[PDB]
Structure 1
């Protein structure tokens, strides 16, 4: 399962697919992202238990080398005046994504951690 079986690998594609994130041997996150990379993209409403489902959009594509970041757009309570644009390097973005899924789905509460909100706000303390 590699990008050379899909579209011709650009240097951008090569660098985004280069990091193999794994906690043991194989990891379902890499091939799931390769499937999205084809142009399916991610857009939907993720259900946060204890509150309400908020729309989120994430797109993976060949972004320039110094800009090798994944961009996610999250609206708070589907309010367009409250839009968060959170983008991070492709090796750093998955760490954010696990914390996001873990905090809202696993704990079943709509309260974000203060240290997690520091990174979302973009406050360099």
Structure 2
């Protein structure tokens, strides 16, 4: 229903992933983003400055090892011709999900970060 209404993951499981990432403000959103990660399916919106936000559908496969790579599937506007496949490490995928919670915290709206679409489009090659 809403990101602030998501229940956090257990501390025994979350504290195990903590030393594999930057130990700072990312620790705060780690329990909530790990819960979102375990969800494997989420609806999200991309915010465009000077435009209107676009609704996309995202699904992915999860694994317990942080060194494993996850394949995520994204569909924008529920169109089969706007299908995206993105594969990246679990360590890096959670940095995106944690950054999403930082955007959520500041504006109180569900918006995915621009850097996620930069890598989704492959602008960094």
TM-score band by shorter chain is 0.3 to 0.5
Question: Of the two structures, which has the highest relative contact order with CA contacts closer than 8 Å and spacing of 6 or more?
Answer: 2
- Name which of structure 1's ranges 30-39 and 52-61 shifts more when overlaid on structure 2: 52-61
Q: Deviations over 1:27-51 (max 9, x none)?
A: 2332012322554742233443433
> Are 2:8 and 1:8 equivalent residues in the alignment?
yes
Report the secondary structure of 2:109's partner residue: coil
Instruction: Mark the structure with the bigger radius of gyration.
Output: 1
Report the secondary structure of 1:18's partner residue: helix
Q: Deviations over 1:56-97 (max 9, x none)?
A: 344465438698233433334554312212231111224455
TM-score with structure 2 setting the length: 0.46
More helix by share: 2
The RMSD of aligned alpha carbons is: 7.6
TM-score with structure 1 setting the length: 0.46
Unaligned runs of 5+ in 2: none
Unaligned runs of 5+ in 1: none
Once the 2 structures are TM-superposed, how far is the Cα of residue 16 of structure 1 from its aligned partner? Answer: 9.1
Q: Deviations over 1:96-122 (max 9, x none)?
A: 557789999999999999998774355
- Name which of structure 1's ranges 36-45 and 93-102 shifts more when overlaid on structure 2: 93-102
* Alpha-carbon distance between aligned partners in 1 of 2:104 and 2:50, rounded to the nearest angstrom: 9
Count how many residue pairs are aligned between Structure 1 and Structure 2.
125
Report the secondary structure of 2:51's partner residue: coil
